Amino acid sequence: MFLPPPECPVFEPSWEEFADPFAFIHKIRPIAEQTGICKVRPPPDWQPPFACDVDKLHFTPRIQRLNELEAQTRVKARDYTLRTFGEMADAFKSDYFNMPVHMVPTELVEKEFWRLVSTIEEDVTVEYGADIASKEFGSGFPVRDGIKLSPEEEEYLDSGWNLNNMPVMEQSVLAHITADICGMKLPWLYVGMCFSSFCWHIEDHWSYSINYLHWGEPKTWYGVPGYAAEQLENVMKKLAPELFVSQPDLLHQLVTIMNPNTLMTHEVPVYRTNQCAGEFVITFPRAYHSGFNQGFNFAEAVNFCTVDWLPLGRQCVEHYRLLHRYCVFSHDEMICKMASKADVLDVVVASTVQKDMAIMIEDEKALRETVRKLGVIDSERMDFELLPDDERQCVKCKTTCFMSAISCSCKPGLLVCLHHVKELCSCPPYKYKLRYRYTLDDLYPMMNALKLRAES
Numbered sequence: 001m002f003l004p005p006p007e008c009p010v011f012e013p014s015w016e017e018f019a020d021p022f023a024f025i026h027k028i029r030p031i032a033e034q035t036g037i038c039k040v041r042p043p044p045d046w047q048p049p050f051a052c053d054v055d056k057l058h059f060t061p062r063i064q065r066l067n068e069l070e071a072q073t074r075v076k077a078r079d080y081t082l083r084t085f086g087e088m089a090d091a092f093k094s095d096y097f098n099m100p101v102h103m104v105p106t107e108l109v110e111k112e113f114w115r116l117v118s119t120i121e122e123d124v125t126v127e128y129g130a131d132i133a134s135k136e137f138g139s140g141f142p143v144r145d146g147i148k149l150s151p152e153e154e155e156y157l158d159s160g161w162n163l164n165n166m167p168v169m170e171q172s173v174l175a176h177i178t179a180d181i182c183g184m185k186l187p188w189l190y191v192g193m194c195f196s197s198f199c200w201h202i203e204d205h206w207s208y209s210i211n212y213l214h215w216g217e218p219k220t221w222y223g224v225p226g227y228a229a230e231q232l233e234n235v236m237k238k239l240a241p242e243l244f245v246s247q248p249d250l251l252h253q254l255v256t257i258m259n260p261n262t263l264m265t266h267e268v269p270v271y272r273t274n275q276c277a278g279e280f281v282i283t284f285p286r287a288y289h290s291g292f293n294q295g296f297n298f299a300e301a302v303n304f305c306t307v308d309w310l311p312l313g314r315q316c317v318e319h320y321r322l323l324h325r326y327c328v329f330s331h332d333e334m335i336c337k338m339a340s341k342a343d344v345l346d347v348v349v350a351s352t353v354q355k356d357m358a359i360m361i362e363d364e365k366a367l368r369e370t371v372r373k374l375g376v377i378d379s380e381r382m383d384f385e386l387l388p389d390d391e392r393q394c395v396k397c398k399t400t401c402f403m404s405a406i407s408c409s410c411k412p413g414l415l416v417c418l419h420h421v422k423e424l425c426s427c428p429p430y431k432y433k434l435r436y437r438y439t440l441d442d443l444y445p446m447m448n449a450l451k452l453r454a455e456s
């Protein structure tokens, strides 16, 4: 028996509201962050055309065995076209229920999905065209390509809700990052079939995500608000310990399927929604989510970070350090990059960056005084941004260094962050060297440019 969680908020913005996606996302934030996910219905006449061919685009989908509480890899079998996948998808659903595929009630698919994943001697597997790269396959939204594009797709070309634009706009703080993260600047495509699923997870660096269903049968979501993140993690710790064993890579994550009623039983707040074609779902920072597809469909998604998010981004990297988990990028390097472009930042952005930078500088000041008192005296400037990430990860906590690190001639090439000075080697501290990006004297004028910028 399944008792569906309460419905998450649904917004229908006017065209005035809709005009600026970052303004609207900020407006709804007090509501939507209480529930983790929300749904956004665009104005009725906002209807972007679809830019992908059914025969000339191929992919190999991941196989999915329907079993609850059981580890999978976050990123990990024949080849299909969009047409052949859809023929497979539709045949599966109609055969499964012995019905025409639109006559299957969404409530029934939902009951049946949760029955399926918890019943052990039913062996049902499905496939999911998941994590297909926008860059190779092509966006479902209109893009500029030196083909010609019809007028109607030229209106949608510059829309903030065109997901190609969202993470490159100026109120998105990830825009300024030069490093081709790709995992976080570029849209990803999901081709679903009935019962194909995504496990409970949160986004890298506790970022937002926005998901658009271009067409097909709905996508069912469950969401948990950010404030209940650790509570959900505690609940999952008791029931399925294996997922929490520290993984030796950022591409070795362990996620799982778990009944939202099990969470609700343990007083974790869960909300649901059926996202239909032409609707957006937004996930908020550190908000756990999971779900499954009702049928053959096509979705596109991207991460993004608002200025609202900057302090959480700092907190997240601190949390990764405690977990010894790899970073996608250095948060500090991103702050300093923006500071170095202070003359051309949005003024609200420059104001928010300056606030985070002040914390960075004070925390850096305290850490440096501490390693000095430990006997590290030798120091030398180092341009950390030039090192590939894997060559500047702390040996202990795996954090990507930028502000500073400790090295020793004893263990060449190795670095620790300043939290793990005692973890580098066994040589005395006077053999150590402090590598730093900036003197405190470099930092304060950078912050000043931001202040000047913000007060104009």
Ligand SMILES: O=c1[nH]cnc2c(-n3cc(CCN4CCC(c5cc(Cl)cc(Cl)c5)CC4)cn3)nccc12
Binding pocket: 075, 130, 131, 181, 182, 183, 188, 190, 197, 198, 201, 203, 209, 211, 219, 289, 299
């Ligand atoms: O409907 C859904 N279906 C599937 N997944 C959903 C979902 N999320 C999926 C992700 C993981 C996306 N993944 C991150 C790593 C990315 C990456 C980066 C790099 Cl440099 C190399 C590689 Cl090989 C891969 C590829 C894209 C996060 N949320 N959230 C909500 C909804 C859904």
Ligand SMILES: [Mn+2]
Binding pocket: 066, 067, 068, 116, 117, 118, 119, 120, 121, 122, 123, 124
């Ligand atoms: Mn099973």
Ligand SMILES: [Mn+2]
Binding pocket: 201, 202, 203, 209, 283, 289
């Ligand atoms: Mn997600």
Ligand SMILES: [Zn+2]
Binding pocket: 394, 395, 396, 397, 398, 399, 416, 417, 418, 419, 420
């Ligand atoms: Zn460290």
